[PDB]
Design a protein around this ligand. Structure first.
Ligand code: 5TZ
Ligand code: ZN
Ligand code: ZN
Length: 342
């Protein structure tokens, strides 16, 4: 993948049964270079029979997304509103004031998003604790992926909501997710259960530092206030701005029934086309260990790396605790679990 373009994968039912092995396969294919990959599930796979029984589901803290800024540079302020049901959210979403405008091609809707981002603030039904998967679904179940991230809960019982538990996101037109990498630079999985599409922008992890540098120049007050202010998830940057400053990036639209995988240190941002619902959580592979050790956290979610270093890096353990671990990450290298596909 020399241009680090977003790749799409079509596993068979057999390939879909082992989650961790398929992540290892897409890395041996070079998917991790883009920082984002699309996975289309087998036609015989269904995580839920129907979504017509969730109208009374409560969104306890919906947020009004106020956006301030100009010239492709914006700050998003999330204003907590009173709790509302899925039914109440959907009615606002499909109303004359908040529904999706007319569009023939993506570029037209994308132009409309960047032109009207600061106007008529929408409501995002974000960070809802929960799952939409039926109990019996064993394949790609966001509630129980069985990766090495499970070690945190196994050893302490500690749960970090949205990180080692699922989050639901009820979107509407122009709802957004700002530029960020995951907590502890972990991997993420996002499934679009139903509704209108979700568009994504990604910056390859091998160019991640270029975006950080650009963000520091444009918001110097924030950079002096926090070591990793992009973790506040308030910064919106248009693709025209990334193009102007030579930041390599790619874009993709996720449709209902599709998965998106984000990779360690893979910067991403995007927006919802209209009323929809996504389910998400973080996960890990052996390659993540180094990212978690080297991750720059908010200085204004921290996972203890000790258990991971002791279990998967005992040879490099003594050097790390002393502070002499001078390991440099090669963002092009696939996870060691990919060896069988190479
Ligand atoms: N670690 C985090 N990742 C997110 C996040 C949200 C979305 C979404 O709203 O669709 C998509 C991708 N990442 C938010 S906090
Ligand atoms: Zn994310
Ligand atoms: Zn901070």
């Amino acid at each position: 993948n020399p241009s680090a373009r977003i790749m799409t994968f079509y596993p068979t039912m057999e390939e879909f049964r082992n989650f961790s092995r398929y992540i290892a396969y897409i890395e041996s294919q070079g998917a991790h270079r883009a920082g984002l990959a699309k996975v289309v599930p087998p036609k015989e796979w269904k995580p839920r029979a129907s979504y017509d029984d969730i109208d009374d589901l409560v969104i306890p803290a919906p947020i009004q997304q106020l956006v301030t800024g100009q010239s492709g540079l914006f700050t998003q302020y999330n204003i907590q509103k009173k709790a509302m049901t899925v039914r109440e959210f959907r009615k606002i979403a499909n109303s004359d004031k908040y529904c999706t405008p007319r569009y023939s091609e993506f570029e037209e809707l994308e132009r409309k998003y960047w032109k009207n981002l600061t106007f008529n603030p929408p409501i995002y039904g974000a960070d809802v604790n929960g799952t939409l998967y039926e109990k019996h679904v064993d394949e790609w179940n966001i509630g129980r992926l069985r990766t090495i991230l499970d070690l945190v809960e196994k050893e302490s019982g500690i749960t970090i909501e949205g990180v080692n538990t699922p989050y639901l996101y009820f979107g509407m037109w122009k709802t957004s997710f700002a530029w960020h990498t995951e907590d502890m630079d972990l991997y993420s999985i996002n499934y679009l259960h139903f509704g209108e599409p979700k568009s994504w922008y990604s910056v390859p992890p091998e160019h991640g530092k270029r975006l950080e540098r650009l963000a520091k120049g444009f918001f110097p007050g924030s950079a002096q206030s926090c070591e990793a202010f992009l973790r506040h998830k308030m910064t919106l940057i248009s693709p025209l701005m990334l193009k102007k400053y030579g930041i390599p990036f790619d874009k993709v639209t996720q449709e209902a029934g599709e998965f998106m995988i984000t990779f360690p240190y893979g910067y991403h941002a995007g927006f919802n086309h209209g009323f929809n619902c996504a389910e998400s959580t973080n996960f890990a592979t052996r390659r993540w260990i180094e990212y978690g050790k080297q991750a720059v956290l908010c200085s204004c979610v921290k996972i203890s790396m000790d258990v991971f270093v002791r279990k998967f890096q005992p040879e490099r353990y003594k050097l790390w605790k002393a502070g002499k671990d001078n390991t440099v990450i090669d963002h092009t290298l696939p996870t060691p679990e990919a060896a069988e596909f190479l």
